[PDB]
């Protein structure tokens, strides 16, 4: 599936050892399916793949 109208908001973030940052991304997709998430910036790491 392809996507469009992506927006990202971080309502709470704390730089710590645990997952102290949470980001809510509003989107619009085209169909149901599995999508891979990856950070292009080395400074941020997401728990979910």
């Amino acid at each position: 599936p392809s996507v469009t109208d992506m927006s990202c908001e971080v309502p709470a973030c704390t730089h710590s050892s645990d997952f102290g940052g949470v980001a809510i991304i509003k989107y619009t997709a085209s169909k149901k399916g599995k999508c891979a998430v990856h950070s292009m910036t080395n400074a941020v790491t997401i728990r979910e793949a």
Partner: protein, 49 residues
């Protein structure tokens, strides 16, 4: 007989004094610091709100 007004009526700042034991109640003077060590179960993360 020549006792005059008691401290119950003449004391400033509206202190009300009771006995058995002797105590001064509700003396409106100054301020007061209060420290609250609130536990962590009461809190909810911003995303859950």
């Amino acid at each position: 007989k020549e006792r005059g007004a008691s401290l119950q009526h003449t004391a400033p700042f509206g202190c009300q004094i009771a006995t058995n034991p002797v105590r001064a109640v509700n003396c409106a003077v100054g301020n007061i610091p209060i420290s609250i060590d609130i536990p962590d179960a009461a809190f909810t993360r911003v995303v859950d709100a």
